[PDB]
């Protein structure tokens, strides 16, 4: 149900980028609905009249994405490659204000569904698959600390007015974040983790349950929303996803999420995850001595659980930045504290 | 060999974007030599020590392209053609250039365009290029949109040296603005399907892949897609036809030769489209002999009319380049040649 400005532009983009019955479509026969509002990444559904016949390949329906409010070449290139490789939505139109993507009938996963075994198992293969991909991007694992550093620096020089924000900020600064960041760096630099191509934001909202596939056991999911992807420590991608088991963002009152540290996957669950990931990420694995299979798994658990620490720290720092620059209704500061609570609680669990 | 102020940048770009041996490579193991210097799109050949064994399936040798002297589209496109195996693989992409697959090869010379085998494959490859879907605007704005952009530039160009002034004055005296409109009226009444066109299909942009000079139908690749867009197919073919007449390897100023006689004969043209059509609508082969001729005769009128836009567009392009480019080349004489070819071709076609 868009506003007159968009939808007219939406109409123009579709008629000009989409082949088939689109190219002759009149404005008056153009259907567009909202999927998400806001000011950053607005989403719309666009479609032909149901009375209108497609001529060929062209889709009956597409997703319009407006970038809203030159790393945008990397994002664009990346998205086009995953499309060609069928890992992502097909790409029908790229232009300065946004893109036109394949519409994929689906819903997103809920937080509690992440712990379902088949779900978890598939997510593990998908992420594996994702990791084996060559991408024309810088292969140096600089993203994780480069990004945390960047946020830290921002964080240190931001000043709130509103009282409750000024308080929450000082308590977080109590921890001495620069010292802690460095503590975390040395801890992780001593933690071997293969640099690969990482989703980096693999949470339930960015995983699709594909329609008509809810019976297929290993084949009903697609990972989307690749905006944070980059070559990174594998441990981060897996640990960050483990961390997401703990957070529910569908909560309808301020601060608009629930943290539950008891929901972090158990040892048995993590093993169930990486037991799908591992054979999906390398060849000979399936038939290594059952004795050495364990050694890798046990080491992989220390790895992901350590890097899950970076997930807490990164997104905690990120969250604080969002509290200053974002207008979206979300308790970013409360969510900041939550991630640092988990950070230190997770610390005490690992004896590190 | 290159200058020190780039041999490093290149080493870093390679160490950091390429897998395999490239990961641990020491600055004193890095080999890099120039392919084409210049001011923009400087080419380089970066390679591993012959004494270094590759760890995986990483490339031993890669091409580095510096942008030097659009933007998102050009990069998406290259990534895509690489993903489809129409273009060189894309090994690394960054703000001031990119790493591409190095293809052992040489460029076609002008005269090779007319070898029946070479011009058959080019037709086939252009046809294949033409069937590709790309995430770009499918409205055929590019042709006259660019000619207007250039014409406006030209009517604004002011030259310093008396000669360029004379020449620009001989060109302006054709009344480009009125001529453009005569052209539009002609092409508007000339049916031509819109497709993804290479738009610059000249010999310098067609590689002859070394080690298959003997292949009959698989010895070429089209490259340099830097002008590619959705456009009237007639232009891509017409433009390529025009390129039979110009040889850019001439070593004395103005550094090209134009040769009207070397424009493809009806027979040669039919030979080209006879390869193109099968490759562009697979059913075409099964048509009635008589019907094929209907369509061929029809495509001849099409491509030869649009060849006019090739002369016009690039003629205007060449005046602009005279003022701005630092590449040594008689742009203004090339412009004059293209407009001569433009008016001669109008007379030939009686249009
Ligand atoms: C005020 N509103 C209440 C309920 C939802 N809402 C909009 C709304 C608001 C906020 C979110 C949301 C906020 C933070 C996070 C945490 N991040 C996880 C770590 C990294 N990912 C970079 C980026 C987000 C997730 C979600 C997620 N998913 C999602 C939707 C509409 C009305
Ligand atoms: C050291 N050198 C001295 C003299 C120039 N030189 C380099 C050199 C030689 C020729 C060209 C050159 C100039 C114009 C054109 C015409 N254009 C055709 C229409 C559109 N295509 C956009 C782009 C080019 C082609 C070439 C082509 N190919 C450009 C650079 C050779 C040794």
Swiss-Prot record, chain B:
Annotated ATP binding sites: 36-42, 65, 101-107, 202, 224
Consequence of changing residue 141 to R: Abolished acetylation by KAT5, leading to prevent conversion into a tyrosine-protein kinase
GO cellular component: cytoplasm; cytosol; lipid droplet
Outcome when changing residue 173 to D: Mimics phosphorylation; promoting localization to lipid droplets
GO MF annotation list: ATP binding; choline kinase activity; cholinesterase activity; ethanolamine kinase activity; protein homodimerization activity; protein tyrosine kinase activity
Domain of life, per lineage: Eukaryota
Residues modified to N6-acetyllysine: 141
Pathway annotation: Phospholipid metabolism; phosphatidylcholine biosynthesis; phosphocholine from choline: step 1/1; Phospholipid metabolism; phosphatidylethanolamine biosynthesis; phosphatidylethanolamine from ethanolamine: step 1/3
Keywords: Acetylation, ATP-binding, Cytoplasm, Disease variant, Epilepsy, Intellectual disability, Kinase, Lipid biosynthesis, Lipid droplet, Lipid metabolism, Nucleotide-binding, Phospholipid biosynthesis, Phospholipid metabolism, Phosphoprotein, Transferase, Tyrosine-protein kinase
Entry's localization field: Cytoplasm, Cytosol
Phosphoserine sites (modified residues): 173
Record field: catalytic activity: choline + ATP = phosphocholine + ADP + H(+); ethanolamine + ATP = phosphoethanolamine + ADP + H(+)
Residue sites binding phosphocholine per the record: 38-40
GO biological process: CDP-choline pathway; cellular response to glucose starvation; lipid droplet disassembly; lipid metabolic process; lipid transport; phosphatidylcholine biosynthetic process; phosphatidylethanolamine biosynthetic process
Membrane-spanning ranges: none
Annotated EC: 2.7.1.32, 2.7.1.82
Function: Plays a key role in phospholipid biosynthesis by catalyzing the phosphorylation of free choline to phosphocholine, the first step in phosphatidylcholine biosynthesis. Also phosphorylates ethanolamine, thereby contributing to phosphatidylethanolamine biosynthesis. Has higher activity with choline. May contribute to tumor cell growth.
Family assignment from sequence similarity: Belongs to the choline/ethanolamine kinase family.
UniProt disease annotation: Neurodevelopmental disorder with microcephaly, movement abnormalities, and seizures: An autosomal recessive neurodevelopmental disorder characterized by severe global developmental delay, impaired intellectual development, microcephaly, early-onset seizures, and movement abnormalities.
Subunit composition and interactions: Homodimer. Heterodimer with CHKB. (Microbial infection) Interacts with PI4KA/PI4KIIIalpha; CHKA bridges PI4KA/PI4KIIIalpha and hepatitis C virus (HCV) non-structural protein 5A (NS5A) and potentiates NS5A-stimulated PI4KA activity, which then facilitates the targeting of the ternary complex to the ER for viral replication.
Protein name: Choline kinase alpha
Part of the full-length chain shown: 82 to 457 of 457
């Amino acid at each position: 149900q868009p506003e007159p400005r968009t939808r007219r532009r939406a109409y123009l983009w579709c008629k000009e980028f989409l082949p088939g019955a689109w190219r002759g479509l009149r404005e008056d026969e153009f259907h567009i609905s909202v999927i998400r509002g806001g000011l950053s990444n607005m989403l719309f559904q666009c479609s032909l009249p149901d009375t209108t016949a497609t001529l060929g390949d062209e889709p009956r329906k597409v997703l319009l994405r407006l970038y809203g409010a030159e790393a945008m070449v990397l994002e664009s290139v990346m998205f086009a490659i995953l499309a060609e490789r069928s890992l992502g939505p097909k790409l029908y139109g790229i232009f300065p204000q946004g893109r036109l993507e394949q519409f994929i009938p689906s819903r997103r996963l809920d937080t509690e569904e992440l712990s379902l075994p088949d779900i978890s198992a598939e997510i593990a293969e998908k992420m594996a698959t994702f990791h084996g991909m060559k991408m024309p991007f810088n292969k140096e694992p600089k993203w994780l600390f480069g990004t945390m550093e960047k946020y830290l620096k921002e964080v240190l020089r931001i000043k709130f007015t509103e009282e409750s924000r000024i308080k929450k900020l000082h308590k977080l600064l109590s921890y001495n974040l620069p010292l802690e960041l460095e503590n975390l760096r040395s801890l992780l630099e001593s933690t071997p983790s293969p640099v690969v191509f990482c989703h980096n934001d693999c949470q339930e909202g960015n995983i699709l349950l594909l329609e008509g596939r809810e019976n297929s056991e290993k084949q009903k999911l697609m990972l989307i929303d690749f905006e944070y992807s980059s070559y990174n420590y594998r441990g981060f991608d897996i640990g960050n996803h483990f961390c997401e088991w703990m957070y529910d963002y569908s909560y309808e009152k301020y601060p608009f999420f629930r943290a539950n540290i008891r929901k972090y996957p158990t040892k048995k669950q993590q093993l169930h995850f990486i037991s799908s990931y591992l054979p999906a990420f390398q060849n000979d694995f399936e038939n290594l001595s059952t004795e050495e299979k364990s050694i890798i798994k046990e080491e992989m658990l220390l790895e992901v659980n350590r890097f899950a620490l970076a997930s807490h720290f990164l997104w905690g720092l990120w969250s604080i930045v969002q509290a200053k620059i974002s207008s979206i209704e979300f308790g970013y500061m409360d969510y900041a504290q939550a991630r640092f609570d988990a950070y230190f609680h997770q610390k005490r669990k690992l004896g590190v």
